[PDB]
């Protein structure tokens, strides 16, 4: 029954505290930066002309927090990504989403994971460094379908019927895409 065995877990528990503390800080920047991209991209729902303006704005915020993922990547020790990966999972997914929509609005195709990683400045695999997880990518893409679902509908409201129709096609391919999996 030694307090001695609780004594030297005073230093571990204390240091883990402070690791999780800094991870939480950098992660909360990226949240804030992201959020302002996400808010601007909202305008597509009401002013159609604004797309180019919002995509350039989004694009710039992404690059602003590709830098933060650099700082984050060095606070994560060794091979212990999935110990803390909880703290940046949601954020990463919203970003995948943002990029995917930006690239759809620009060129009308689905961004590959590789590119999302490249734009964010992260790796394609576990091995060579702080990476971008397939499940995250897939879940971000999944948000996309739901967002364009809304956009297909506001396009009819803003009487751009032809566009609304295309959106629908694309969402169709995402759904077939997903059923390949289930």
**Residues placed in the known binding site for Mg(2+):** 147
Sole window of 29-37, 58-66, 88-96, 110-118 interacting with its own copies (rule: CB under 8 A): 110-118
Q: How many helices (H) and strands (E) does the chain have?
A: 9, 0
Is 11 an interacting residue with respect to its own copies (CB under 8 A)? no
Start-end of H helices in 67-160 = 68-75, 81-84, 86-107, 113-120, 134-157
Question: Taking Cα atoms as reference points, which of 58, 144, 54, 55 lies closest to residue 93?
Answer: 144
Quickly count: other Cβ atoms within 10 Å of residue 112's Cβ: 13
Q: Which is nearer to its own copies, 29 or 106 (CB)?
A: 106
Q: Which of 49, 74, 128, 180 binds its own copies (CB under 8 A)?
A: 180
The answer to whether the beta carbons of residues 48 and 87 sit under 8 Å apart is no
Contact 51, 44 (CB under 8 A): yes
| Residues facing residue 123 across a β-bridge | 131
Residue from the set 59, 71, 83, 87 that interacts with its own copies by CB under 8 A: 83
Q: Provide the annotated binding site.
A: 147
- In the bound complex, what is the minimum distance in angstroms from residue 38's beta carbon to its own copies? 19
15 sits near its own copies (criterion: CB under 8 A): no
Q: Which of 20, 113, 131, 163 binds its own copies (CB under 8 A)?
A: 113
Chain positions contacting its own copies, by CB under 8 A: 1-3, 5-7, 9-10, 12-13, 78-83, 85, 108-110, 112-113, 126, 134, 138, 149, 152-157, 161, 164-165, 168-178, 180-182
């Amino acid at each position: 029954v030694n307090l001695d065995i609780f004594s030297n877990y005073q230093k571990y528990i204390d240091n883990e505290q402070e690791v999780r503390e800094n991870i939480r800080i950098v992660v909360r920047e990226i949240e804030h930066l992201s959020k302002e991209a996400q808010i601007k991209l909202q305008i597509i729902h009401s002013d159609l002309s604004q797309i180019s303006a919002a995509c350039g704005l989004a694009r710039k915020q992404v690059e602003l927090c590709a830098q933060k993922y650099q700082k984050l990547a060095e606070l994560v020790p060794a091979g212990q990504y999935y110990r803390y990966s909880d703290h940046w999972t949601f954020i990463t997914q919203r970003l995948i989403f943002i990029i995917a929509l930006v690239i759809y609005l620009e060129a009308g195709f689905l961004v590959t994971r590789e590119t999302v990683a490249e734009m964010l400045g992260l790796k394609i695999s576990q091995s060579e460094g702080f990476h971008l997880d397939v499940e995250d990518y897939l879940l971000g893409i999944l948000q996309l379908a739901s967002e364009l679902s809304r956009f297909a509908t506001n396009s009819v409201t803003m009487g751009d019927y032809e566009r609304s129709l295309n959106i629908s096609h694309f969402i169709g391919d995402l759904n077939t895409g997903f059923r390949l999996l289930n």
